[PDB]
């Protein structure tokens, strides 16, 4: 079997010890007294050195087996960079959930009412796109690490202007770069999630439940799909030094205990560093599911049971052009077994706000084929964005 690492690049073996050391009963004469090396005297052997006090700049870590938090059983941790090979199918298995395509009917209807329409909605949306892609910068072509965050903040500001119609929108706030974690078990596997959110919208009141108890119970017929020979833990980080923690994102006593929506961004300029659509959706489920579970465990303790009051959380993710929407309902905390009542998730995938943008006009033979600005704008996508924001008030 080929061994990696050619010998010439490896550190060289220590010099052989002087033969005078072999002879028993003889004291070698070395250059230790001189305090410097000479080629014609024996090489001293020194005992290991101890400073006698701690210098912070030269601290040295103890080995893994000596760590106080070392545990023989392994914990698999899912974090931002993890990219699941099987995509959604693997994500559903880990979270014991059933998938429904399309958004819930209640949320969709919120925007069909023309009363919820914003004034000059289509024109204002077009301006935000142009500002994000061209106008905000002094450069000729801005980069994704700037406009991808910018488009989302501007859209939130547009929707947030609806407080004039609905005074009840003053009961929610938003934070930046909050963190979330949860520990749970699936079929003898210890699993943990460590993550962060770009922005988190929190409300003072819980969201309405989506599915009735009858629908929740009917899920028992559904069976979670498997993907042999690939294990469920492929692409997760195996850790032997870990601590069990749960985190919603705020400490106890926060006036707005109900998280409303979670936002996730793909702002990397280079394509290989950006999650693909399916892998982005898988990340959204686990991160959102962790937020819901941590909130549950907080209220009902560490016991496992089917929840009397299901918890609902929303999630939105984008790279600045394509948008994906998510709604999750947490029905049970008894995840050890693979059979029983299952959680439910609604997904709307690959929603294009615009197809392309030109920062300079396209000229062929002194004819302007394409003017600057968005191409093939689709207003439908924003309405789905607006509907999720309004949910829970209107």
């Amino acid at each position: 079997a080929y061994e990696w690492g050619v010998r010439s690049t490896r550190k060289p073996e220590p010099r052989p010890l002087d033969r005078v050391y072999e002879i028993p009963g003889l004291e070698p004469i070395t250059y230790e007294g001189k305090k410097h090396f000479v080629p014609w005297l024996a090489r001293p052997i020194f005992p290991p050195w101890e400073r006698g006090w701690n210098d912070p700049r030269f601290h040295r870590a103890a080995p893994i087996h000596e760590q106080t938090l070392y545990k023989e059983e392994p914990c698999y941790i899912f974090h931002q960079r993890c990219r699941l090979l099987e995509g959604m199918k693997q994500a559903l298995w880990l979270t014991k959930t059933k998938l429904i395509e399309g958004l819930p009917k209640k949320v969709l209807s919120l925007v069909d009412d023309p009363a919820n329409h914003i004034e000059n909605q289509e024109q204002r949306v077009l301006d935000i796109i142009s500002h994000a892609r061209l106008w905000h910068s002094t450069e000729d072509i801005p980069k994704r690490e700037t406009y991808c965050p910018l488009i989302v903040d501007s859209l939130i500001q547009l929707c947030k202007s609806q407080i004039l119609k609905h005074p009840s929108l003053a009961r929610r706030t938003s934070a930046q770069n909050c963190t979330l974690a949860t520990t749970w078990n699936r079929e003898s596997l210890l699993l943990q999630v460590r993550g962060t959110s770009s922005t988190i919208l929190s409300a003072k009141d819980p969201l309405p439940v989506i599915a009735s108890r009858e629908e929740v119970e009917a899920t028992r017929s559904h069976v979670l799909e498997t993907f042999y020979p690939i294990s469920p833990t492929i692409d997760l980080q195996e850790c032997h030094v870990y601590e069990v923690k749960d985190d919603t994102g705020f400490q106890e006593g926060y006036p707005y205990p109900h998280p409303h929506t979670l936002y996730f961004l793909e702002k990397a300029n280079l394509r290989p560093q950006r999650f693909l659509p399916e892998q982005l959706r898988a990340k959204m489920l686990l991160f959102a599911f962790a937020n819901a579970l941590a909130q549950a465990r907080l209220l009902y303790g560490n016991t496992a049971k089917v929840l009397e009051q299901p918890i609902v959380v929303q999630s939105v993710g984008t790279d600045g052009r394509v948008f994906q929407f998510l709604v999750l309902q947490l029905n049970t905390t008894d995840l050890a077994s693979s059979e029983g009542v299952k959680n439910l998730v609604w997904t709307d995938s690959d929603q294009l706000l615009y197809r392309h943008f030109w920062c300079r006009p396209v000229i062929k033979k002194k004819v302007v084929v394409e003017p600057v600005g968005p191409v093939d704008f689709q207003p439908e996508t924003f309405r789905k964005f607006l509907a999720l924001y309004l949910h829970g008030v209107v």
């Binding site: 301006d127 142009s130 500002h131 061209l134 106008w135 905000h136 002094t138 903040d153 501007s154 500001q157 947030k160 202007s161 407080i163 004039l164 003053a170 706030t173 938003s174 934070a175 930046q176 770069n177 909050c178 963190t179 962060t196 985190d247 994102g249 705020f250 400490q251 006593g253 926060y254 006036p255």
Partner: protein, 329 residues
């Protein structure tokens, strides 16, 4: 080659120098000249302070020196977004405004002349060039201009300072690079006017450090220099977007406001632009001049104990609300 002007700078008496570079007169005070549940706003603002300091959970900064500065940035961003949100019903214009975070403002102008002192070009006459490159923490841009604070051609007896030495003696250095005039967005954007700016002072210039360096008298001067440079740049860029330059001077005054905070103390300033004719050629017979009004720094609160903010002052909160409630006529 052009001098580079820093709004936030540690040099002594920078404000007096910036007046000469700009032809601005500074008046201490405020410009000559509906209940909204002030208690509710007090609750909302206190929520913002406590959320970032005591409730949010986020990864600690590595540096250990960015921690204090990073905290102060978080609260100021939260305060601006809420106050702008809460006050939208009373002032409808705030609903259609555009809110910017750490975007760039640029201005380039000519003022003065000098003789080249050495080399093969010795004796030739050259203009003195300046540029301001700035990045305000927050700013609001609207699509309609605000009303004036005093009529154009307003005259007061106070005299602009005159400096004997060259700008170099105030530590100030030159470079050659692109000249830019920028309001925060390109000319194609509809929102071409300014409403208010929010600034956060670097930790290097805060009150405690200055006292140790023995320049206690410079605590207030730092605030003034930041306002004069930042607001002169923003108004000048706005005017040139309307087509006015040194040889076609402004016909209507341009106005804007700013609040400058070091994290706890706050001060308030207003600026009016009357002249873009600052060059030697265009300034030979010009009686106009630019005006700036400012106030001394006042604390907004003192400390956070348990989960309660202690020392909240309503008087300062009124000034922030008054600035945000100004509207076009």
């Amino acid at each position: 080659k052009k001098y580079v002007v820093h709004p936030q700078i540690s040099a002594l008496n920078a404000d007096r120098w910036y007046q000469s570079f700009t032809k601005t007169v500074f008046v201490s005070g405020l410009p000559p000249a509906p209940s909204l549940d002030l208690a509710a706003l007090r609750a909302a603002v206190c929520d913002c302070i406590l959320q970032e300091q005591v409730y949010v959970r986020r990864r600690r900064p590595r540096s250990l020196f960015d921690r204090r500065q990073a905290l102060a940035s978080s609260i100021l961003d939260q305060v601006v977004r809420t106050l702008v949100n809460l006050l939208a019903p009373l002032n409808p214009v705030l609903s259609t405004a555009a809110l910017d975070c750490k975007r760039s403002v640029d201005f380039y102008w000519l003022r003065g002349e000098e003789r080249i002192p050495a080399g093969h070009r010795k004796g030739h006459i050259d203009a003195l060039r300046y540029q301001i490159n700035d990045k305000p923490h927050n700013q609001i841009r609207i699509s309609k201009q605000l009303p004036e604070f005093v009529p154009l051609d307003y005259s007061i007896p106070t005299e602009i300072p005159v400096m004997k030495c060259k700008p170099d003696k105030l530590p100030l250095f030159r470079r050659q690079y692109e000249n830019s005039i920028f309001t925060g967005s390109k000319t194609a954007d509809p929102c071409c006017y300014g409403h208010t700016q929010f600034h956060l002072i670097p930790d290097r210039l805060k009150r405690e450090r200055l006292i140790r360096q023995n320049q206690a008298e410079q605590v207030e001067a730092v605030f003034r220099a930041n306002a004069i440079a930042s607001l002169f740049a923003w108004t000048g860029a706005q005017a040139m977007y309307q087509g006015f330059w040194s040889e076609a001077d402004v016909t209507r005054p341009f106005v804007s406001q700013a609040v400058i905070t070091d994290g706890k103390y706050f001060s308030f300033f207003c600026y009016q632009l009357n002249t873009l004719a600052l060059t030697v050629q265009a300034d030979q017979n010009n009686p106009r001049k630019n005006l700036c009004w400012g106030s001394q720094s006042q604390p907004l609160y003192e400390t956070v104990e348990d989960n309660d903010v202690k020392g909240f002052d309503d008087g300062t909160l009124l000034q922030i609300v008054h600035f945000l409630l100004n509207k076009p006529r």
